[PDB]
Amino acid sequence: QGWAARSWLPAGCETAILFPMRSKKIFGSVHPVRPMRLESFSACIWVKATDVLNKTILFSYGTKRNPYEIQLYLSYQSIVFVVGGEENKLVAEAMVSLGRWTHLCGTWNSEEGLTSLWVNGELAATTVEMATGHIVPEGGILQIGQEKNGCCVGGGFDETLAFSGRLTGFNIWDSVLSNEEIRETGGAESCHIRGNIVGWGVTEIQPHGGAQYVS
Amino acid sequence: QGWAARSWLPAGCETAILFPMRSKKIFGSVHPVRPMRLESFSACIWVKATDVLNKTILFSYGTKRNPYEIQLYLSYQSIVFVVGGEENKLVAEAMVSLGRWTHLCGTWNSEEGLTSLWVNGELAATTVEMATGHIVPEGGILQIGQEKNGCCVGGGFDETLAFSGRLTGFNIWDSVLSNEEIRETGGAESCHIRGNIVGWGVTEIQPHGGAQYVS
Amino acid sequence: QGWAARSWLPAGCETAILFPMRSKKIFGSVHPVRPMRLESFSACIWVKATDVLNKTILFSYGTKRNPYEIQLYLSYQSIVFVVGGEENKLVAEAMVSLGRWTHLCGTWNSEEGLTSLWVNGELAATTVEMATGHIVPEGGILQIGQEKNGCCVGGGFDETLAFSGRLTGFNIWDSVLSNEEIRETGGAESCHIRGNIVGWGVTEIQPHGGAQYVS
Amino acid sequence: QGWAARSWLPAGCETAILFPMRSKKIFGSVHPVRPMRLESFSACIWVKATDVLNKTILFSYGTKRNPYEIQLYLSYQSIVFVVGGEENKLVAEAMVSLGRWTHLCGTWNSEEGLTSLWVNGELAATTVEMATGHIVPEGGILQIGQEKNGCCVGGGFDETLAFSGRLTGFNIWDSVLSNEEIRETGGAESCHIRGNIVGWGVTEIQPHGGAQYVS
Amino acid sequence: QGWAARSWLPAGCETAILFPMRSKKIFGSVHPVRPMRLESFSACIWVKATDVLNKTILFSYGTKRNPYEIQLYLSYQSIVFVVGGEENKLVAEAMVSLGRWTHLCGTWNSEEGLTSLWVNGELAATTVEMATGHIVPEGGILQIGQEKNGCCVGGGFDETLAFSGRLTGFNIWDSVLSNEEIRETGGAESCHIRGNIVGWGVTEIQPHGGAQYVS
Amino acid sequence: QGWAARSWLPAGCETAILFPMRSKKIFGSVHPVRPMRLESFSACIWVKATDVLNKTILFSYGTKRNPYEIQLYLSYQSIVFVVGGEENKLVAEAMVSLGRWTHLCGTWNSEEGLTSLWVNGELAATTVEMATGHIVPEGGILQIGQEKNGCCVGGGFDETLAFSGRLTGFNIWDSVLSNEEIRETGGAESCHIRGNIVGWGVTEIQPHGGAQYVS
Amino acid sequence: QGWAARSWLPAGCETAILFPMRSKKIFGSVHPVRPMRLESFSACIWVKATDVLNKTILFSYGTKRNPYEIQLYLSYQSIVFVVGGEENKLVAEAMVSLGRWTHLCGTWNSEEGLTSLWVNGELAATTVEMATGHIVPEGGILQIGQEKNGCCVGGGFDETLAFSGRLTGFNIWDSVLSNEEIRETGGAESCHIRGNIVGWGVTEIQPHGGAQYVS
Amino acid sequence: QGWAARSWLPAGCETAILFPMRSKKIFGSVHPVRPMRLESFSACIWVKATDVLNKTILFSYGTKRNPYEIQLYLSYQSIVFVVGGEENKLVAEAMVSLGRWTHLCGTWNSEEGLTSLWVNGELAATTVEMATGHIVPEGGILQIGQEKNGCCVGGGFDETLAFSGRLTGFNIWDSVLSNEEIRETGGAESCHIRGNIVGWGVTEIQPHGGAQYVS
Ligand SMILES: *[C@@H]1O[C@H](CO)[C@@H](O)[C@H](O)[C@H]1NC(C)=O
Ligand SMILES: *[C@@H]1O[C@H](CO)[C@@H](O)[C@H](O)[C@H]1NC(C)=O
Ligand SMILES: *[C@@H]1O[C@H](CO)[C@@H](O)[C@H](O)[C@H]1NC(C)=O
Ligand SMILES: *[C@@H]1O[C@H](CO)[C@@H](O)[C@H](O)[C@H]1NC(C)=O
Ligand SMILES: *[C@@H]1O[C@H](CO)[C@@H](O)[C@H](O)[C@H]1NC(C)=O
Ligand SMILES: *[C@@H]1O[C@H](CO)[C@@H](O)[C@H](O)[C@H]1NC(C)=O
Ligand SMILES: *[C@@H]1O[C@H](CO)[C@@H](O)[C@H](O)[C@H]1NC(C)=O
Ligand SMILES: *[C@@H]1O[C@H](CO)[C@@H](O)[C@H](O)[C@H]1NC(C)=O
């Protein structure tokens, strides 16, 4: 039991990415096939955080002129969803427990800045007028476990921002999932339902700097 | 059980190749010791497809002058077996299911263009006069999960053609297997039955571009 | 059962580092974020030694001018804790059995040179006036399984000093842990307890020379 | 039990080396710290052969002047032990079954050329006057799964000689083990018994060319 | 004077590619940024051939379905220009001398199949109705010194086809250059004249397999 | 003469960086020891441009928040100097010529936004009130021949922005050089004059993506 | 003058291989396309030895059974030519001077064991009945600057045997060259004369372990 | 003359090592085959320093217990020769010119601690009773251009200690050279006279971290 418990993966998922540590060079890169130009999206992930600091990035999308087009990050017990800029922040106060698998979904629509944050399929936080009329542009860099800064040596990333733990089932839909669907994506057998922008198991994800597929 | 099931391999096989994603660079290369000059053959494989598009390659043999000497590939619900050229398709209409280990095996003979396609040991489709009198040349490149295209350059493959999922038990015989032998190669303990042209566990197979042995 | 036994990891821990052999090049490097300047410390680790010689290093800290600022090493059945110099040696006489996961943790305070060794939560040895008033300097190199000698080129480490076996849960605190906390760090569910100088799963640890994360 | 049988390792052994295929470049290199100068020796290994040809090398010791100072190899159902030269050959006739873990020991003494083969702890063959008065020289290259000639010329080994399958517990003693000890090295809990020239888990073994530790 | 001669480069160019040998893996890859779709073109190069066989490739463009969309190759003293297929040759006679820098430039127009071959600025051969109405397709692979073949397998190319010697000033224009311009591109200080499809010093060229920039 | 001329380097300098082409991955990285926090600066370089587009970067400093803290780039015959943002631009109209070693210096002072641009030691453009009171921040990435966008990710730079040609003598001073000193940095024997922020031959510069030291 | 002299190459040769040192891992590998089965041969090379020990290898051919099928090596001022075995040896007594380009060429014919050794085009030694009726086998490994031994990770070659200095113009003919031709291969422009078994500039030669092409 | 002057190397030497910059990772490693146990020695080098700080290492020998067994390093105007420990300095005050080739020899004898420092063949400084009766130990690490730390570490060395510029003719004799011999080693054609412990061109020297052979 002790092995099967620690080797357990949440949905029917068969692969995860391990972050054995935080460091200045560990990150995952995500390579969507179709462009990340979005007027609304849902972004869901399974996270098993080892340790949480002031700001541990789960995933981050950013362009050249705006590093913070989308972020999902943990702040101790809290979860922080960011769209369009650091000032555009939705906080779920107390939701993440270390060392156990928890499912997160962000959800945002430009047309009313309508934003929503879900934990294990329950509405954790909601807000309106967040980045109203903003459009997430194409051509940015999407990462997991780290924020845009630089993989290209000379210092690397900010080690204090890095994720440590395990991730699986990273999915982005170019659209707001209905509440019913959001509960489905967290379901016991849900790993096969995957996003149309980023689909876990189809979209190229490269671990770097000591991140590993745990297959 | 779920942790045992998520790691189960179909026959007694004890290695598979994981394709964690489709990508411009992911493929397996296969290096037969004896030449791929064939007047008849049987080609069997275990596949566990993650996701299927319009054409996802399971394996492909091609020469410099003809990229499509042999192909087995999946369409959204269908298995397509190609010999001698893209125009020579045998299509089995409706019997590949995602996330389930299924055994496929194709059989062809030049002498009457007699071709046959088998799924989990059942005859799925058959045809005659397919590539009649054609001989598969030697000196081609055999790949799994991707079709012959640009390989040494950055990227170079068509990302939409790539396999994603798991493969095991890829076998090629320089002969038409009898119907009883075809049912054997799918059997519960069949992994030790291996091809004389390509034998799983014997023929050198190199995963590239993020494909992994899952040993 | 035996298969689940050979993969069992001691506390709730889910990653370990395997040393498949001793050699002139195998070691782990440890990269603390905050400086290793210490006036007292606690250093705990889980070890499953394959084979023990006159001196098998579990971990070693040192600088240019003093290679032996801290060492924990095994000497056949004995455990040896070193602080400030090779002359400053605390020996627990008969405490390591091969092939069994055992928890070791050392504690030292400069203010009285007070020093203790703990094995599976029981006080194994203690001494006073060991390196009294010494301060462990910063900017040194911390290693697991090997002592300062190699890196770079030439197969520089002493192969006879190298660890072989498995390690997990390497932790360093910048303080003397109370006896009750020391018994906690060996507990069945303790892996979430991690040090503020080195934390297992948080501090960057790089295996080299054939050392592997097993995870 | 599907996964447990596949992942079972014979003695208490907690690592093996997988040869996923035969090829011109796959081999293991073994690096004894003390010299391979031998007037007698015992050499034991666990093998799980995938496929056996005319000659599949399990391990081979040779020098520049003589590639065949020691060989253990399989020849279909037969096991062949070589000392001092290809002419000096002891054959056990029908002793190796594919896909099953089996334990082999060779034993040789120069003083009478007395030689024995053991399979699963039973004496399988014996002979006398084999390489009488010969001394195995030091300074040779010891390999597992492949024979000396080749390497670095793009592999350059004879693909037909290569092992495929799994190996564990490779051990060499600089002495004739007694019959009682030989039965112990095959025991259910014997993996802690290791040789003084080559010890499994102690002597550096490097897999090359697609050979892998399975850990 | 001896050293000045050995290092001399023909036009004002200050960069060449050396092919120190022919082999199964030496080639240059060329990466035009705008597509190689051509209804007419001019292709000029400086060659210093070390040794010429029956077919030594200077450059080759081909697609998956047609390896021979464009080739320029030497055949002993003869020079052979290919467009649209092997069957479509323009052969100049007795024109390349080994070890001497010579400028070659091909020219072709689909509209009348008008084709022309130039050596050191003099018309060497001309023909008409060659690949009339053919359009060179985009999306192929352009190489220097070697022909489209396998490249990501070990070796893979036909060693007898490979160039050996030095190359510089490889240029392609999406148009027929006038005779005046063709004489200019061979000029003593012409090297700054570069093509709009491939420009020397501008288009990415990667030497592989022991080819070197000697700049 | 031509052999000596093609290898000539401008001042006494005895190394340069060659950009053989303008690919998506070619760039130089520059690693100042002391911080790039600047209230005034002088930046000088020797350039021998092969080919110039709308915008060919000579060097670029930028942070995560602002990619354009400092840029010097060529636009056909024009030189463009940027400080604090793309809107803050000083253009020298018509004085870079392809294939000729030319020396450039930009100087800027925050305290009046006083900015000046120099070509071969002659004042070429000047402006007041450019980025007045702005301070260039620390912690950015300094590059030569390319603009911050992103290595990894398969290259990820804009190919049209990349420099091609040769560079030497890149120097940055944390002060406005006097007009006399600017003429000195251009002098025929000036290579020993180097900056206190970036000094040619002391600051670490790494060529990437096919950029080469020519030594 | 000295700048030209230090870079001068002997014949018209436009490429050399530098051995900067005599380490345990430096060697050149030579890959003839047609087999090294020889009943007679001629083997010529240019050498500029830095330092000579009792045995410095210029080139060596051997098989697993016999490392010494052909060797040319220097022994202080002496030159030693070996065919078929170390016992079969032709010694030119006092003929190699350090730091000077000197042409050596050996010549052997099995039919009478007729053997000849030439220095700068002059007959230096001759003998008969050397390896009479021996045939040099195919399938051996040909090296320059080092003798057949361990490559791999095997600790490498014998450092004392290694060449240091420069080599060019290594050529092997499958025949005895006439005396007139032997004087030609040393001539002022002779670098274009190359062997039919090994030809300098056409046969693949790979420098390893710090050996460099000087081009 | 412009190129010939900057390409000139001091003695007959025809290779040097370039340090294009100081950095945390640039160094040379030196691998004497016979032990560095010394009771007296002479150590000579050609240096062309680009830039000199408080302490720029030319070469350094150190053990595990003592980093400073031997050092030769420059200071802003001065050469400092260290034997046995940092406290044992022989300082020559005012005689390295930046950018000009100069020949340095250190000379030390344990018996009277007699030490001598020579610049361009003239006695620069002398002292007695320096490290009297000390013996330089076996088994240390000898470096050029940097002081003993670990590398790895993503760097590790103090960047402010690193050499930048060019080095050639690094020679160590296990003896005090006579004054006559010391004037020889600096001679116009002295490159061929080389040390018996370290000989330039025979002892393996590996450049690391962007140090380059210039050949
Ligand atoms: C956590 O993050 C916020 C940024 O939103 C920062 O203001 C604060 O300093 C952090 N908390 C602590 C305790 O440092
Ligand atoms: C599926 O593939 C066929 C080729 O047989 C193609 O004609 C068709 O367009 C594809 N379907 C879709 C929906 O793209
Ligand atoms: C074990 O180590 C000690 C050093 O503390 C040494 O004196 C001794 O030789 C060693 N014992 C053996 C049996 O080698
Ligand atoms: C098996 O090996 C022997 C060498 O001992 C050889 O004579 C024989 O040809 C081989 N057998 C077959 C069937 O090839
Ligand atoms: C060269 O190739 C041509 C084919 O174009 C062939 O006809 C000819 O015989 C070949 N010659 C040789 C010597 O191989
Ligand atoms: C060159 O750059 C400028 C930006 O200042 C832009 O306005 C213009 O479109 C460009 N010129 C061309 C011909 O594209
Ligand atoms: C050199 O080699 C020969 C063997 O050919 C040997 O007889 C002799 O001892 C050696 N000489 C020296 C000085 O080592
Ligand atoms: C240079 O080095 C010496 C060490 O002998 C030291 O005393 C001094 O502080 C240094 N000089 C400067 C200007 O830092």
Residue-by-residue DSSP string for C16-47: EEEE-S--SS-EEEEE-SS---BSEEEEEEEE
Count residue pairs from F and H with Cβ separation < 8 A. 47
Of the residues G7, G9, G202, G203, the best mutation for testing chain E's interface (the one with the most E CB atoms within 10 Å of its CB) is: G202
Residue pair F215/H212 in contact (Cβ under 8 Å)? The answer is yes
Q: Cβ distance C187 to C46 under 8 Å?
A: no
Q: Which of A54, A68, A158 to mutate to test the pocket of ligand 1 (most atoms within 8 A of CB)?
A: A54
Q: Which helix (H) or strand (E) holds H3?
A: helix H2-7
- List, in sequence order, every beta strand (DSSP E) within chain G: 17-19, 27-31, 40-49, 56-62, 70-75, 78-83, 89-92, 102-109, 114-119, 122-127, 141-144, 165-173, 204-208, 212-213
Query: What tokens appear for G21 in the block?
Result: 């040192």
- The first and second tokens of residue D207, run together, are 């897999």
Q: Say which residues have a Cβ less than 8 Å from residue B188's Cβ, sequence separation at least 6.
A: B11, B12
Rounded CA-CA distance B76/B93 in Å is 10
d(CA F72, CA F102) in angstroms, rounded, equals 14
AA letter at B84: G
CB D84 within 8 A of CB D131: yes
DSSP state of B81: E
Residue A149 covered by a domain: yes
The Cα angle at residue A41 between residues A35 and A42, in degrees rounded to 5: 120
Neighbours of D111 (CB within 10 A): 10
Residue C2 lies in a domain: no
Q: Which structure tokens are listed for A209?
A: 């700097």
Name the token pair of G154: 């095997």
Structure letter (DSSP) for residue H1? -
At D112, which helix (H) or strand (E)?
none
CATH number at residue B54: 2.60.120.200
Range list of H helices, chain C: 2-6, 179-185
Identify the H or E element spanning H171. Answer: strand H165-173
Residue with the smallest CA separation from ligand 1 atom 9 is A54
Count of C-beta atoms within a 10 Å radius of residue E97? 12
Under 8 Å CB-to-CB from B199, ≥6 apart: which residues? Answer: B171, D51
The DSSP output letter for C136 is B
> What is the dihedral sign for C-alpha G125, G126, G131, G135?
positive
Opening angle at CA A101, ends A95 and A105, nearest 5:
55
Strand order in the sheet with G78-83: G89-92, G78-83, G70-75, G56-62, G141-144, G27-31, G204-208
A5-44 as b/e: b if 16+ CB within 10 A: ebeebbbbbbbbbbbbbbbbbbbbbbbbbeebebebbbbb
Closest CA to B171 of B150, B202, B145, B147: B202
Tell me if E147 is assigned to some domain.
Answer: yes
Strand, coil or helix: H117: strand
Other C-beta atoms lying within 10 Å of the C-beta of residue C40: 17
- Whether A54 lines ligand 1, by a CB cut-off of 6 Å, is yes
Number of CB atoms found within 10 A of residue H179's CB: 13
Order the strands of the G165-173 sheet from edge to edge.
Answer: G122-127, G114-119, G102-109, G40-49, G165-173, G17-19, G212-213
Q: Where is G184: in which H helix or E strand?
A: helix G179-185
CA distance G148 to G144: 10
Closest CB from B31, B150, B208 relative to E141: B150
Q: Which two tokens stand for residue B171?
A: 């076998």
Which residues lie below 8 Å from residue B126, measured CB to CB, with a gap of 6+? B90, B115, B116, B117
Method in brief: cryo-EM
Report CA torsion sign: B192, B195, B200, B202.
Answer: positive
User: Smallest Cα–Cα separation from G95: which of G116, G113, G118?
Assistant: G118
- Is C65 a domain residue? yes
H-run or E-run covering E136: none
> With b meaning 16 or more CB within 10 Å and e meaning fewer, what string describes F192-202?
ebbbebbbbbb
Q: What was the resolution (in A) of this experimentally determined structure?
A: 2.5
Within 8 A of A194 by CB-CB distance, chain B residues are: 51
Distance from C-alpha of G21 to C-alpha of G146, rounded to nearest angstrom: 12
CA distance F104 to F106: 7
Question: Taking Cα atoms as reference points, which of A209, A63, B160, A213 lies closest to residue F66?
Answer: A63
Number of Cβ atoms within 10 Å of the Cβ of G68? 21
- How far apart CA C142 and CA G108 sit, in angstroms, is 61
Residue A133 domain flag: yes
Contact F73, F55 (CB under 8 A): yes
Whole-angstrom Cα distance, residue C106 to residue C191? 17
Ligand lying nearest the CA atom of residue D52: 4
Helices (H) and strands (E) in chain G, counts: 2, 14
C-alpha span between H158 and F33 (Å, rounded): 11
Backbone angles phi, psi at A90, to 5 degrees: -115, 120
Cα–Cα dist A135/A133, whole Å: 7
Nearest-Cα distance to chain E for B182, in Å, is: 31
Chain D CA closest to residue G151: D152
Q: Is residue D80 part of a domain?
A: yes
Calculated CA dihedral for residues B117, B122, B123, B125, nearest 10 degrees: -60
CA distances from H19 to B25, B197, D84, F213, H16 (A): 37, 54, 52, 12, 10
Name the phi and psi angles at C57, rounded to 5.
-70, 130
What is the domain range of residue E80?
A: 16-213
Angle at C195 between CA C190 and CA C201, to 5 degrees: 70
- State the Cα–Cα distance between residues D20 and B204, nearest whole angstrom: 8
What single letter denotes the amino acid at residue C19? F
Judged by CB atoms closer than 8 Å, whether chains meet at D148 and G64 is answered as yes
Instruction: Compute the radius of gyration of chain D from its Cα atoms.
Output: 16
8-state DSSP, D38: B
Query: What b-and-e string marks burial along D32-60, b requiring 16 or more CB atoms within 10 Å of the CB?
Result: beeebebebbbbbbbbbbbbbbebbbbbb
Which residues contact residue D63 at a Cβ distance below 8 angstroms, ignoring those fewer than 6 apart? D69, D137, D139, D140, D141
Query: Does A153 sit within 8 Å of F150, measured CB to CB?
Result: no
Q: Is residue E7 part of a domain?
A: no
CB contact under 8 Å between D33 and C159, yes or no, is yes
The token duo for G54 is 């009792």
CB atoms closer than 10 angstroms to residue A158 = 15
Q: Is the CB of A160 under 6 A from ligand 1?
A: no
Place of tokens 């001669």: E5
CA B173 to chain centroid: 12
F62 close to F147: Cβ distance less than 8 angstroms: yes
Within 13 A of C112's CA, how many CA atoms are on the CB side? 8
- Closest-CA residue to D149 (of D157, D160, D161): D157
Residue B77: left if φ>0, alpha if ψ -120 to 50, beta else—which one? alpha
- Does C6 reside within a domain? no
Instruction: Output phi, psi for D179, to 5 deg.
Output: -60, -40
CA–CA distance, H121 with C107 (Å, rounded to integer): 58
For the beta sheet containing E78-83, the strands, ordered from the edge strand earlier in sequence to the opposite edge, are E89-92, E78-83, E70-75, E56-62, E141-144, E27-31, E204-208
Q: Is residue D96 within 8 Å of D52, Cβ to Cβ?
A: yes
In total, how many domains does chain D have? 1
d(CA F119, CA F80): 12
Backbone angles phi, psi at H198, to 5 degrees: -115, 120
Contact H27, H96 (CB under 8 A): no
**Chain-centre distance of CA A86, in angstroms?**
16
* % helix, strand, coil for chain B, step of 5: 10, 40, 50
Residue that is written with structure tokens 């996701």 in the block: B51
> Which residue from D6, D164, D214 is facing B201, i.e. has the nearest CB?
D164
Q: Which residue matches tokens 């107390």? A: A94
* Beta sheet of E102-109, edge-to-edge order: E122-127, E114-119, E102-109, E40-49, E165-173, E17-19, E212-213
Are H197 and H34 in contact, with CB atoms under 8 Å apart? yes
Query: What residues contact residue D78 under an 8 Å CB cut-off, 6+ apart?
Result: D91, D92, D93, D94, D95, D96
Number of neighbouring beta carbons within 10 Å of residue G60 = 26
Q: Are strands B102-109 and B40-49 parallel, antiparallel or unpaired?
A: antiparallel
Q: Are A155 and A20 in contact (CB under 8 A)?
A: no
Cα–Cα dist B12/B10, whole Å: 7
CB-CB contact of F116 with F123 (8 Å): yes
CA distance B71 to B91: 12
Give the one of B31, B67, B153 whose C-beta lies nearest to E141's C-beta. Answer: B153
Query: Which residue lies with its CA nearest to atom 7 of ligand 1?
Result: A54
CA–CA separation, E168 vs E16, rounded Å?
5
Q: Are strands G17-19 and F27-31 parallel, antiparallel or unpaired?
A: unpaired
Is residue B88 within 8 Å of B82, Cβ to Cβ?
A: yes
Give yes or no for a contact between B80 and B90, defined as CB atoms under 8 angstroms apart: yes
* Closest listed residue to residue E191, CA positions, set E15, E3, E6: E15
Chain B residues whose CB is inside 8 A of the D7 CB are 14
Contacts of C149 (CB under 8 A, 6+ apart): C156, C157, C158, C161, H64
User: How far apart are alpha carbons E179 and E109 in whole angstroms?
Assistant: 14
CA angle C94, C100, C105 (to 5 degrees): 60
Contact in structure between G56 and G74 (CB atoms under 8 Å): yes
CA–CA separation, B90 vs B84, rounded Å? Answer: 12
d(CA A13, CA A192): 8
> How many other CB atoms are found less than 10 A from the CB of residue C169?
28
Nearest CA to ligand 1 atom 8: A54
